[PDB]
Amino acid sequence: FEVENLLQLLTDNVSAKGELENLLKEVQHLKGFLDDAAKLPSDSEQWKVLVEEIQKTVHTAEDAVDKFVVQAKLHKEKNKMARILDVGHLATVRNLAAEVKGIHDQVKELRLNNQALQARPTLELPQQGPALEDDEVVGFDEEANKVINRLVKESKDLDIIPVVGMPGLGKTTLARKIYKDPKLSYEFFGVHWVYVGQSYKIKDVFLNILKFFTRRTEDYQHEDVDALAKVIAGFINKGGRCLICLDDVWETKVIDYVKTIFPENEKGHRVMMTTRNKVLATYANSDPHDLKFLTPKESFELLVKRVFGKKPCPKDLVGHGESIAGKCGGVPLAVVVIAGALRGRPNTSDWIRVERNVVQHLYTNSEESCLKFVEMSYDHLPQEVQTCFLYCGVFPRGFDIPSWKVIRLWIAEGLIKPQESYTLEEIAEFYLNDLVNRNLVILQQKRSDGQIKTCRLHVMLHQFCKKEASNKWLFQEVSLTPDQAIDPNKSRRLCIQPSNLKDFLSKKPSAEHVRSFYCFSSKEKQIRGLTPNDIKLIHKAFPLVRVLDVESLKFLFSKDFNQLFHLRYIAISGDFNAIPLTFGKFWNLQTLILNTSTSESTLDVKADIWNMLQLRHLHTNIPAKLQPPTATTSGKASCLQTLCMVAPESCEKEVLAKACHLKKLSIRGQMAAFLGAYKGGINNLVELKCLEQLKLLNDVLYMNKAPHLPQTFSQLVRTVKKLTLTNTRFAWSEADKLGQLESLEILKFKENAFAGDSWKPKMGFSALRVLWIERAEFETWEASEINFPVLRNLVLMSCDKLETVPFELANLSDLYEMRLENTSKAVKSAKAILESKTDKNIKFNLTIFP
Amino acid sequence: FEVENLLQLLTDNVSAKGELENLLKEVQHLKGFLDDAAKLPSDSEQWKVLVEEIQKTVHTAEDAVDKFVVQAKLHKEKNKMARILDVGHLATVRNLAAEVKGIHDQVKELRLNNQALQARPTLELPQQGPALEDDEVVGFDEEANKVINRLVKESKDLDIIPVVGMPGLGKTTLARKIYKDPKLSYEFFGVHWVYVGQSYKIKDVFLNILKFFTRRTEDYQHEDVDALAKVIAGFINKGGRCLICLDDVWETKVIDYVKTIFPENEKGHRVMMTTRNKVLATYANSDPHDLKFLTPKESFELLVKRVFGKKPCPKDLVGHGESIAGKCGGVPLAVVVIAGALRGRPNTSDWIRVERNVVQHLYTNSEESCLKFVEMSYDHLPQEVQTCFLYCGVFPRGFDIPSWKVIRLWIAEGLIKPQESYTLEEIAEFYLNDLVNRNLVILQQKRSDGQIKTCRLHVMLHQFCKKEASNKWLFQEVSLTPDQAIDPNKSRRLCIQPSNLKDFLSKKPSAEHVRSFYCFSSKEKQIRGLTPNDIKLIHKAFPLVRVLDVESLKFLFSKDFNQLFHLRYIAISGDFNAIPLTFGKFWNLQTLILNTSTSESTLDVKADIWNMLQLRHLHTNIPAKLQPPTATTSGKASCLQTLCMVAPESCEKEVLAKACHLKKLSIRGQMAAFLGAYKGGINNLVELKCLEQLKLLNDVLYMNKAPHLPQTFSQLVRTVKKLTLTNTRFAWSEADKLGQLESLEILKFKENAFAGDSWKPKMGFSALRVLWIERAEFETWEASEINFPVLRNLVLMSCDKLETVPFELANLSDLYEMRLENTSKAVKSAKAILESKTDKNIKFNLTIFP
Amino acid sequence: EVENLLQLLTDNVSAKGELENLLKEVQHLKGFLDDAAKLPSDSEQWKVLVEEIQKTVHTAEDAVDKFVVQAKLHKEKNKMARILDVGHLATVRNLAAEVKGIHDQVKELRLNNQALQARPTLELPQQ
Numbered sequence A, B: 001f002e003v004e005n006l007l008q009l010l011t012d013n014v015s016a017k018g019e020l021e022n023l024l025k026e027v028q029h030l031k032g033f034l035d036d037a038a039k040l041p042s043d044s045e046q047w048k049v050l051v052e053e054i055q056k057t058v059h060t061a062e063d064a065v066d067k068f069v070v071q072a073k074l075h076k077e078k079n080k081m082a083r084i085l086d087v088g089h090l091a092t093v094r095n096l097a098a099e100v101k102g103i104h105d106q107v108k109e110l111r112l113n114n115q116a117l118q119a120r121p122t123l124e125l126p127q128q129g130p131a132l133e134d135d136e137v138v139g140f141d142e143e144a145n146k147v148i149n150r151l152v153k154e155s156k157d158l159d160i161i162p163v164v165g166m167p168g169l170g171k172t173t174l175a176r177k178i179y180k181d182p183k184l185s186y187e188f189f190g191v192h193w194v195y196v197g198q199s200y201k202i203k204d205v206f207l208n209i210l211k212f213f214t215r216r217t218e219d220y221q222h223e224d225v226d227a228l229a230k231v232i233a234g235f236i237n238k239g240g241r242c243l244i245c246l247d248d249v250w251e252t253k254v255i256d257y258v259k260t261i262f263p264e265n266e267k268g269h270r271v272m273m274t275t276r277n278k279v280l281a282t283y284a285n286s287d288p289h290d291l292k293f294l295t296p297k298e299s300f301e302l303l304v305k306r307v308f309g310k311k312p313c314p315k316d317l318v319g320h321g322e323s324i325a326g327k328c329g330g331v332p333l334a335v336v337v338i339a340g341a342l343r344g345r346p347n348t349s350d351w352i353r354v355e356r357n358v359v360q361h362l363y364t365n366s367e368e369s370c371l372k373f374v375e376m377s378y379d380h381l382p383q384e385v386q387t388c389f390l391y392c393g394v395f396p397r398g399f400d401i402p403s404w405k406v407i408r409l410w411i412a413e414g415l416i417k418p419q420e421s422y423t424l425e426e427i428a429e430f431y432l433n434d435l436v437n438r439n440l441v442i443l444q445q446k447r448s449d450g451q452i453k454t455c456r457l458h459v460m461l462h463q464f465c466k467k468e469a470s471n472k473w474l475f476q477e478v479s480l481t482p483d484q485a486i487d488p489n490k491s492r493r494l495c496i497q498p499s500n501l502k503d504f505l506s507k508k509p510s511a512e513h514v515r516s517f518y519c520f521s522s523k524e525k526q527i528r529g530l531t532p533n534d535i536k537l538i539h540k541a542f543p544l545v546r547v548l549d550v551e552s553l554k555f556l557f558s559k560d561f562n563q564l565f566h567l568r569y570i571a572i573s574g575d576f577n578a579i580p581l582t583f584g585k586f587w588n589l590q591t592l593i594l595n596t597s598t599s600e601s602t603l604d605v606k607a608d609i610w611n612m613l614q615l616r617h618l619h620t621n622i623p624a625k626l627q628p629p630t631a632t633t634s635g636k637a638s639c640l641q642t643l644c645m646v647a648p649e650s651c652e653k654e655v656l657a658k659a660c661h662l663k664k665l666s667i668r669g670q671m672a673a674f675l676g677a678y679k680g681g682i683n684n685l686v687e688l689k690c691l692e693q694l695k696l697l698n699d700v701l702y703m704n705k706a707p708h709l710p711q712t713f714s715q716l717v718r719t720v721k722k723l724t725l726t727n728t729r730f731a732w733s734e735a736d737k738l739g740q741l742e743s744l745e746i747l748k749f750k751e752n753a754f755a756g757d758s759w760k761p762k763m764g765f766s767a768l769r770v771l772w773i774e775r776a777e778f779e780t781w782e783a784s785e786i787n788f789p790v791l792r793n794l795v796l797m798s799c800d801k802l803e804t805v806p807f808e809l810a811n812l813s814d815l816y817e818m819r820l821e822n823t824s825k826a827v828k829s830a831k832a833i834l835e836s837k838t839d840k841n842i843k844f845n846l847t848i849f850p
Numbered sequence C: 001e002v003e004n005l006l007q008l009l010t011d012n013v014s015a016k017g018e019l020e021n022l023l024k025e026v027q028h029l030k031g032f033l034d035d036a037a038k039l040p041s042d043s044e045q046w047k048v049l050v051e052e053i054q055k056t057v058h059t060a061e062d063a064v065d066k067f068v069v070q071a072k073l074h075k076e077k078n079k080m081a082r083i084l085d086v087g088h089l090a091t092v093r094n095l096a097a098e099v100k101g102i103h104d105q106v107k108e109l110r111l112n113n114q115a116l117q118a119r120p121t122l123e124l125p126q127q
């Protein structure tokens, strides 16, 4: 046995690398086939079987390759004596080699046996409703009047009025309503309608337009595009003022084609167009008309209308009907589709069937129209954003998906690929920005800069993403009808709700193909009765985790968890006084979010963060006392872009030299002991090159002496875009020192950041965009035009002490935004400045709470 | 082990040659498949995987074959005792045979397993914009006026006015603007427009022409081509003067089909035709109208004319806007396309996304029209010029590509193939000449003979070439987002930049499939901190380099660098006193450029250049002391065409006999000891048969005795076409002999080449084309018509002493060009000659600086 | 190494049995030597044979003592040092191979040479 064992063991190691490379190349083949098959439309159960099988074989080979490389690195870590001497290593490594050969031959026979896989040169092989009347439209009366108003206002220029939203949001219904208002007839000689959609031809559109202006299109079918444009221009000139309806135009070229047909007769014509692309709407009109959201009562009224015509919904179905109405998120088409499923089912058994879940019920049966309706644009997304989109589907339904969390989740799953001059963080931020541009992913929260802060995936879109991923298996959500498991073995990843986590753990989960663990707290901070054994068994179940993201728990650094070298992105919480060195073995790691409940003032990062080349972002809820890099660790600049909640002690010349590419840096502690010359730890910030954000927080309320912004501070932080001061109690004279930042973009004064009865700024802020003052005790302000020449946003919250916003800021042309939150009499001056700007008729916004 | 080793080693080598030949045949098969695949359009990921795989396998097998032959040559180079005795020889040889056998079986299974490769008889499987008005056309006002002036000028003959330029340059916009001037209507009764493009049918063109002259084309659809020609001629005769606008005509047959329609009514009709082929335009009109280049302000105004139409661009987007405007190189289609990318994106995050790199942003997404716009003519080039073009896509963006550098680079990359009566130099020069003819490759510098000197790839075309090569993998440019490497393993070649070279070395590069090293100095002479260790690392990383081209460095002749026997083309610089014999082992060498910083007056070529049969061109920045060929080296005439910077001592009877086919020879040193009878080194030039260029340079400013050209000099250099004399200090009487060269074509008197207060030439120069005089101390010139009968260019520079250009040169009909750079009062005589020729109305150009 | 590990492990897969057989056969040769010492001898061939049996007996004794010393050294080392040591494995089985060689030498010494055959009572022995 041992003779034979060692014989085959030695024989195999001689092709382990060749077997590895051949398996990897053939798995690349199968992955290319898999992309092809995903693109293809399929209807044969055998084809779904084969796609399932190739996906599972591909992911099995991926696990084998990652295991082999991880073992190789582990061996290289061991000393030469423990390298040669180890015999268990020999057994495991050759068992791994044997598995790799088995899977390689499996891939060889997968390619050879199945004819479908053969390489092909270029071979992938790929109507409205009834029409409502005014009484059938719901809650659009105010919207219709607003849009018609916008249309009718006299303006010699050809102004556009676009309507934009999400798939099946009712836009075409708003246009059809608008299209049949007598007011529109009064204001315009001839209103004509046209539908474009994603697929169209201009000549079709131009011919249909011409039909309205003459019935002899048979004569002009021989005219060219520009001749037709001139003809229609003359026809309109004869007609007079005209409004043209455009249903679902998604391309700028189309708009720029439509401007042509309108003559320059200074009649102030109009074109109102529907577009699922917010950017297209924005170009069409500089101020869009985002289709409102139906309120739950309106949705219930619509469902009543549909599943019972005009006869009232019967009494007992009202409860269930109400339930169905609210759950649809406020988009009419979800109501429409579930009503379709409910047509003529006055028996409450089926109403209860449909209610119990009303997101799955769309995308089923023949009248699934929601699916294809959304797909009308998903295919309008490139593959990179296709995938980055689908991974918005992990977050629980109704969850608020943070911008940074989702950005690092994308970048931690390997979905994004590097570009030739950009950084993965900004490529991903652009991907999500664009995802909102296409209205694909709701965005209701705006950073001071105006960037995404919380994006949600609409209930209908949530179920669409979940089911689409499940079909592609990129991830999945575990469910349990009382008992059972829904085949999680067909789940490349598992998203588990905390409530069912204990039960899923009771079955002793154990998976290898799994490559992440998602368990978010939609009900924030509802940490259930999870024992340490639960966390240990979690560590056991998923050994190949790239993405271990769980924050509603008391996590611990079990030995098993310490072995997870494949780790990429960690979101854990508990009571940790210092990061153990075990984190120094997670070479694959790219991100680390830390939220510790420890009473310790500082967290000691024992793990050598410097050696982790793949590392990109470390986040801590409390200041981190990072060890400086040693001589051995000296090398290339670290990949670290974001380093949040840094202890000032851990800001040394060597650390900042090792993180010169650091972008987002936050430091909290004692400041005066950090601001002096011998406190040049601040002077050490010169090491940071691409630094952009800097949060300064003082943990002491009783300060020995008030610090002073060093004169070098102007250039010490020259690269910083965002700069938040918290509990700094700086003299407003120091605000002048803050006026010498060339690249200052955002400015937050939080918790008496600046101490003083009144603020009289002098230095101009040639680029500042957002001013943010929170809980400022200073009573009067005399900021002038020169101070903030390019003010675009000014936020002052909890200003119970401030007296009046200076009128001088009214002159600022750039300034359009002004929010006063829990502010004193200065609210009156906000009204005065708003009135002045309205008299000047400058686009400006004023928000007052409550 | 040793028994089995030697057994296998002997058995395989018995079969090594058969294995080699069979592998070569099968790799020829895969290369033919690749030639098919490149043409065939494809969109399937699996097929791109297969093409990647066949490319990698083919290049791997090519490396194996070249390594095996190099080893064979090395072994044959060793002595018989050093041949039989060597044991490492057998080890490496039999390992190489094992690798060759492995890759041969790889190719066998690549063919058999994959059905895509089966031989097939004949089986590869292969609209305007909106239209503007005159306010949307930028900066073409003067251009349109110039073109219309060219048009309307009265002339009985049917003169043509063509508009030519690069893809996406806006020609059709100029024509349309021309097509809508009232002036054109005033000067012509009937103006009609026709679109041809690359693909067209005459009958469609003629029928559409006939429509403008009668609405009954339905009647004449049955008439033959000549019948339609006569009909249109009669219609034009009835109409009178006519200008016909032609869009995108590329083939001359079309032009000569258009002359037919026009009647001979001595009405001076006109034809306007746009054409991407500069030669076609030149035929259409003897003086083309190269569409001007939009200035950066015009490009910014245009981009405003789209991303914000007529509403002025907001303030903060101007900075970014200006950046995105100038970067487009001065062609409106780059502006248009990146605008399309920017449509309705007033959030400056995306403006900065697009600005950072504004050449990639074309050729991406749906509205990438730049790509297909260039491809509409890339297929217009045969495969040879197809490839030669793509290797203009390796010089850094904005780099000025020298004519000789690129010519040899082509010929050194294995892209050109020999013809049946031509020499690779002139085939390649013709290829680049055409690459300018088709407007493909910009050309802004002219050699005195009038051939290309510098050529550039327009930023748009540069990125197109880079991406096209990268898809085909013919080469690639290494990039690093902070860290990382972009998979350079899929880069058959690496084009790195000096800025990133140090970091590239930091990763310890090691490649085998790489077959060249491109590192040019766009910022000339910016040699960064590259240590000798860096150069050694270069030598190590790329062992199979055919083309090693790096001059921004301090290169050294390391032992490893001496091994590169596959070497073809060298471009190196440093401090070398004499070329080591190590270069005598580079049997594959074809070219050698040398730029040595040594203070030595002469460089001694220790390497036996005579034995290098593949050698074609040696270049040195200082005179070279070549060793004469020995008796053993005696054989066929050397392939050497160009031999630059030759020490006069290095010009011996035997040397020149061995290089009788030498064409470009340059000699520098002490000359007075060169012209004498016992200095028959001048007489030794009789050996050169196809000598074309001859540059004579004297390094001494204090000459013992004024030299004197030999009487034989006339027939000594009878084959010379170019003859640049520098610092010769010759009496103008000696110039009279210069009229005794039958084949003289170029004449550059540089740095007091001829000494004398005045020049009074007598002998005629029956063929001289371009005269050329730098820094002439002579004061008065008395040349006449007989002296320069066929003068085509007359360039006089730094002639601060020259008094007046003789008026007699005015009579010269051939003379069209004349340039006075930093010239004295003779500039006034230049004005006199210009006025006289203008009075005679002879097509003449005068340039004066400053 | 593959052939090396094969041959070593297969030699061990018995070193104790080879050891004991060699020991008993060397006891045989030692008894023969005790006989031959008493015997008067005058034949150069017999002195050659006695020299040879003495050298073979003492060679086998050196091999046996070396092998037991190596075994004791193994037992001295820690369990980790016992299992992990690879050079020790090579020396162990080289010693075992030498023991097999000497044992075969003793077998052929007995069989080839008649002189060694067992015999009940045969030792042949003026002022």
Ligand SMILES: Nc1ncnc2c1ncn2[C@@H]1O[C@H](COP(=O)(O)OP(=O)(O)OP(=O)(O)O)[C@@H](O)[C@H]1O
Pocket: A129, A132, A136, A137, A138, A139, A140, A165, A166, A167, A168, A169, A170, A171, A172, A173, A174, A248, A274, A275, A276, A302, A332, A333, A336, A373, A376
């Ligand atoms: N207020 C409403 N009351 C009743 N039904 C409505 C209402 N709004 C929309 N619908 C229904 O929605 C469906 C029409 O959706 P619509 O075409 O307007 O969607 P959309 O968001 O504009 O989509 P797209 O951009 O793909 O055209 C029809 O069933 C129509 O009856």
Ligand SMILES: Nc1ncnc2c1ncn2[C@@H]1O[C@H](COP(=O)(O)OP(=O)(O)OP(=O)(O)O)[C@@H](O)[C@H]1O
Pocket: B132, B136, B137, B138, B165, B166, B167, B168, B169, B170, B171, B172, B173, B174, B247, B248, B274, B276, B302, B305, B331, B332, B333, B334, B336, B373
């Ligand atoms: N306002 C404008 N100012 C300048 N150029 C414009 C403007 N609007 C469109 N264009 C140019 O018009 C071009 C239309 O194609 P055009 O025929 O003029 O290009 P070309 O390079 O001359 O040759 P080809 O006919 O092969 O396309 C577009 O490339 C765009 O660059």
